Ligand binder design. Structure first.
Ligand SMILES: Cc1cc2c(cc1C)N(C[C@H](O)[C@H](O)[C@H](O)COP(=O)(O)OP(=O)(O)OC[C@H]1O[C@@H](n3cnc4c(N)ncnc43)[C@H](O)[C@@H]1O)c1[nH]c(=O)[nH]c(=O)c1N2
Ligand SMILES: Cc1cc2c(cc1C)N(C[C@H](O)[C@H](O)[C@H](O)COP(=O)(O)OP(=O)(O)OC[C@H]1O[C@@H](n3cnc4c(N)ncnc43)[C@H](O)[C@@H]1O)c1[nH]c(=O)[nH]c(=O)c1N2
Ligand SMILES: Cc1cc2c(cc1C)N(C[C@H](O)[C@H](O)[C@H](O)COP(=O)(O)OP(=O)(O)OC[C@H]1O[C@@H](n3cnc4c(N)ncnc43)[C@H](O)[C@@H]1O)c1[nH]c(=O)[nH]c(=O)c1N2
Ligand SMILES: Cc1cc2c(cc1C)N(C[C@H](O)[C@H](O)[C@H](O)COP(=O)(O)OP(=O)(O)OC[C@H]1O[C@@H](n3cnc4c(N)ncnc43)[C@H](O)[C@@H]1O)c1[nH]c(=O)[nH]c(=O)c1N2
Lengths: 382, 389, 388, 383
């Protein structure tokens, strides 16, 4: 199947299961929504997983296009569908071959979800301070602690938990945990203000025991940073998709709205806003594609796992999320006033799109964290 | 009671009835919420209505402070409680003595709401194009048409409707209508994204008959512009109140959030944001008060109704709502990213405050409409006369 | 005469001596320009100095209107003419009666300038770290050190220098120094990017000796903060004046520029920008007037000097300079693109007005300094109190 | 000659002839400055001209890197050196072989400048209203009219003038004119507020006669739009280079400025600003490269001239100039306040860089014009 044919399948899924269903998608309905099963039936679930595990092995450049099309429909749906790339990419590069086969093989075959548990309430983004601990006890690993936010965990097949070693407090380990391990408790689902088609949870571990072979190889904080390269780029692509939707929603309104005796699409102030939007969308698209191409070129190296350990955070993954999160938010903010009073009602979608797009600058590192990281890694040394 | 004790009563009301009860206020609950009757128990309902019409006669300058305090708790509650100033000010200035005694005379003692119906879907802000018509039938006026948005109408005691005459080339008339006039239908309540403690309705008229004496005296679109001077200033005051709440929510979060081994209130980036917020709040407050003082000075003139026909839209009422609506949105927008992931949840109030404060730049004229009005009314005539000219 | 007649005199001065003379004012010519002596002849120099010293004693509210009219013509001319209020207000409240008669009397009668020397290179705005010292030597004070920027000093009658005592753990003192004091050296004039009708200097002291009675009474850094209340409000009023000029320059251009077959003043995008400008000018004006009225109400109190030591920096003086500096810069930035290519030449004044208005957010404390000061003085203590 | 080697030559030229010389560069000195002859001596003048006319034939992608390096030193020097691409690309695609041999050949070998005269005062960007006229007189063309702004004209070898046909008012023609043609008058040099190492002129024509074959083939307004694809992308690349310089000036100041007991490079507000600048520079770079790569792919087609007549303005050329002009101005605006009082003096370069970068959003179409063009061409039709 061609790349163009796959994108048409995604576009038909959006038109068929998302567009016109903003009501249910924005309702924080019992998870998972049936539409996720419908996406499974496309054959495109986990589309990035390598062919060695029965996946399609699609590159991140193609993923940018897929995610932009999904998020045009609903950013919470796109998020839920691409975010497992964070977990699978960490397992792909730093798990043993037997661990990869135990978890990734079934993930693809069963059309399932997985999740990564990094965030904690008190540590915040200062991840050296995380308090979730992992202890060796014979042939098992023992997890204890509370993890603040993780998406899809309740219906995931397995999780990767970033933990600090109690044995050596200077050591951090990523630990694979199956969903129904003893001692794993889903504490609650968060009442998110947007992306309300996604489900995000607080999770607690108390004497949670898993086999010793379940740890990934490497500093868990460095592995997390590497896994976030893919998800940060696709969060940027999601913001691009919402901005495209906002543009199209403005044009649909402008065709029928009258001002000064003509459709609003003929008005100079409106034209100026939409031309600025289109410029911004063009730049966001080129930035996402540049970042994805760089990601794919590195992942194609036969030594990619070792190369990525040296690299850590990819500069253009950080800058793509920063730029697209800021720009799509600014587009939504402008458009939130372009529909008069009806734009202040749920009869128009712009209110939802604005809440949805707000996630991009917040999740996986806010812009204070990421500005500092870009500065320390790519300005100070240069 | 002093002005200071009245504001203490308003603050106590917000503390007792609004703060901590944000869930019900954001729920679009069946209207009117019981808290509006509880506000009437303070003695402050319709606080601006002149002494000559049975009210406390508080000035708009004091109203700015009252609204700011109410909106600090909830902008939709504030909005519901001050918006009738638009209606009562038009009737007080331009209604006949008989009409004023019939509708304004009892309003304060009844603790009643009233509403103004200007907006329409097809006309937009081009109200010269309104399609709600008023036709004369002997000593009676007959209304027909659909009005797009009006706040509190369902539980209001009476309304003022802006209509175009069906008997004249281009004549506009403000017509007073009791809530239960036959022919008046409340079509639906709007599912608003914020201010969900306020209730706003679409309303239709079919052969709705009222006495000819129910028409206010004057060009109805000019009367509406004059009435909007007060509500535009108080919308600005509401945005100021929400901005003060956002500042305080940031400080409360910063006291217990840790960064680099110390509370966030010690961080330089945080301090910079809050110092900027405080500057913007100070500027908003001085603009609202300046606009209100100017309004009060005109309204105290003995010929105020005649003066206001000549003046029309007050420049600083327009610029107050423009500035405060923009600034408070910018503050909420900045603050929406200052709480990390928990700020993306309903565990924090910022998401609600962002939806609430968004109303200020939209309602009673968006900023494209208001920039053009300021330009045409004040910039163009001035440009004739400048030292650079 | 009346306040309106006074403002007409200022407007006439601007129309006759400033407007149309962009080239000379922007040239960093030998200072002071002759137009300053022309202004002296109006009888309005040092218009704020109290009548007890021969001055007109005009309030800061009126000063806002005067300065905005001057700055409409040229922000550097306005700056040069109002900035001595920083120095004279400190001397007026915290100098001895003898010191006030020795310096303020002649300043008015002789139509002179004076300056305040606070800023230093190494200390920056962290003026607790200033390295300019003052040492007692019997009944005389001895000053040593380098001061970074001070306006009009070379042709000023006298200065007030903020110094750190060499005889105390941490004592700061404001010291009056006559221009002809031996040991006072004007190192150089700064080649400023805008306000090139003003002259600002680096100044050094070496064994510069003055009588002990030349010291003002009080913590020198607090006195400075109090003196800056007036000058910060008037910097705000200057930015307001420049914003008014930018609005008017846009309207004059728009009347004769054609677009889509009609004057640009009929265009919707233009109307929106100018409506936004006018909103911002109105808000700036009301902020400046509020700050000035609060300043005037405090200064009218019989115990004003004592009250001001307790109050220090005035919240609305800081917020006025912050707001007007940011807003006038935003207006100039927008306008710098509104004239097409001719706007990128000296045939239009917008390039100069942009450079001129840039001063307002930089001078007398940048916005990083001022946001932090507003935060520490007004946000942190009131967070002890709030309904939430 | 590797590409990295060529870029090293450019960087060495910037270090030798530009850095530390802001005084002279900002002074609107007698033009052309001697440094342009020094650039000619590198062998890189007119580096984009195809090898068919003796040029190096470098693509626009490499040109983006070259211009960014030049503009890092001085945007006005960069502008003067790359802007002839507008003129040469028009002649290359729409001139006859004889015209190309007559004007493009010698341009490369003689290391000269050429210029395009499009803008007019009364027409503004409403170019259908241009009033400069061209009339046929036998086998010759007669030009009459005043052109508002043209860069390097006084020392150019030749010009392309956009004119309206006096015979058929519906027709627009691009006409090549030798600099020394009788009837061509350089009226004045504009006193520009920035890029004061460049020279831009008002030019008038009175009975200016040239051979008929000096005309390019095609609608002159469409040809101008096509030529502007390259120059608009390189204006964006110039703004990028100035933004990189501003970042570096901030870092050099922050290393020696003290704040709360530590160098300013340790301060959180400063780090936030510079991290934001670096993100914006990365995005600008990737947008310029994407636009240049699309330009190069189209220019490499055998039928490029025909393809480009259909295409007209390239979307990503417009969006690159729009984005980079806005972003680099915003960076300059923020930095103009980051140096305290010394930043308000000519002891610091930020004042000049601010004036320099201001050109990018203004020249070759302001953003009101370009937002409307992007809207009409790329938003409205895509139903
Ligand atoms: C819907 C949804 C979905 C998910 C998640 C959250 C949400 C809301 N997350 C967690 C999310 O990625 C996380 O919330 C963000 O990275 C932000 O980190 P914190 O909330 O800890 O705030 P954090 O502590 O980083 O920042 C909070 C505030 O503190 C200030 N601050 C922080 N750093 C600063 C600095 N350097 N300088 C100045 N100020 C600074 C700022 O005001 C900032 O807004 C997650 N997690 C996970 O592990 N797996 C998952 O699947 C998901 N998915
Ligand atoms: C919660 C709530 C409560 C109320 C109301 C609304 C809501 C949402 N209103 C109505 C409200 O005041 C009204 O919606 C606003 O004035 C805006 O008018 P329109 O919705 O018609 O949009 P409008 O047609 O004015 O604008 C829609 C869009 O058109 C564009 N546009 C409009 N004018 C333009 C211009 N000059 N130039 C360029 N673009 C332009 C802009 O994109 C703008 O966003 C009301 N009404 C009433 O009568 N009584 C009441 O009590 C209330 N209360
Ligand atoms: C034309 C002209 C005229 C005058 C003056 C200057 C000029 C240019 N001044 C001096 C002027 O008031 C002084 O330049 C400003 O107050 C700023 O002080 P510094 O230059 O020391 O920079 P300062 O050290 O305050 O700031 C420099 C940079 O450091 C950063 N920074 C500083 N504080 C920060 C913070 N808290 N947080 C984060 N970042 C921070 C910022 O990047 C800022 O731009 C003056 N002086 C005088 O005594 N008498 C006079 O008459 C005049 N008049
Ligand atoms: C240093 C320098 C160098 C050069 C040039 C200029 C300068 C200053 N130019 C000319 C330059 O490209 C030209 O100035 C710009 O394209 C802008 O065109 P106009 O100046 O005619 O203003 P234009 O008329 O396009 O715009 C002026 C103002 O009108 C308003 N406006 C315009 N269009 C609008 C719209 N659609 N909607 C709303 N408002 C609108 C805006 O306020 C705008 O700022 C040139 N020319 C040439 O032929 N050859 C060359 O080499 C050069 N190089």
């Amino acid at each position: 199947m061609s790349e163009s044919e796959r994108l048409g399948i995604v576009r038909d899924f959006v038109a068929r299961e998302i567009l016109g269903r903003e009501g249910i998608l924005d309702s924080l309905a019992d998870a998972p929504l049936a539409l996720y099963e419908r996406f499974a039936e496309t054959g495109l679930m986990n589309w990035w997983v390598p062919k060695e595990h029965g996946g399609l092995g699609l590159g991140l450049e193609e993923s940018v296009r897929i995610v932009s099309e999904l998020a045009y429909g609903d950013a919470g749906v796109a998020f839920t569908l691409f975010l497992p790339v964070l977990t699978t990419s960490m397992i792909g590069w730093y798990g043993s071959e037997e661990l990869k086969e135990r978890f990734l093989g079934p993930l693809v075959a069963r059309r399932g979800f997985c999740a990564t548990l990094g965030s904690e309430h008190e540590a915040g983004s200062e991840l050296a301070r995380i308090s979730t601990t992992v202890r060796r006890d014979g042939d098992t690993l023992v997890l204890d602690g509370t993890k603040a936010f993780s998406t899809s965990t309740d219906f995931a097949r397995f999780l990767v938990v970033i933990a600090r070693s109690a044995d050596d407090p200077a050591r951090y380990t990523a630990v694979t945990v199956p969903r129904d391990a003893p001692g794993l408790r889903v504490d609650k689902r968060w009442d998110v203000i947007g992306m309300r088609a996604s489900a995000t949870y607080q999770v607690s571990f108390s004497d949670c025991r898993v086999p010793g072979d379940n740890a990934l190889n490497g500093n868990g904080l460095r592995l997390l940073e590497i896994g976030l390269n893919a998800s940060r780029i696709l969060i940027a692509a999601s913001a691009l998709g919402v901005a495209r939707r906002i543009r199209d929603v403005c044009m649909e309104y402008g065709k029928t709205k009258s001002l000064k005796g003509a459709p609003l699409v003929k008005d100079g102030v409106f034209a100026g806003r939409l031309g600025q939007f289109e410029m911004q969308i063009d730049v966001m698209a080129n930035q996402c594609l540049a970042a994805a191409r760089a990601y794919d070129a590195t992942a194609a190296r036969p030594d990619a796992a070792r190369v990525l350990l040296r690299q850590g955070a990819q500069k253009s993954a950080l800058t793509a999320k920063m730029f697209c999160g800021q720009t799509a938010w600014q587009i939504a903010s402008t458009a939130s006033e372009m529909f008069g009073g009806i734009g202040y009602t749920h009869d128009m979608v712009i209110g939802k799109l604005l809440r949805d797009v707000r996630h991009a600058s917040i999740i996986e590192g806010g812009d204070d964290v990421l500005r500092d990281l870009v500065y320390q890694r790519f300005v100070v040394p240069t």
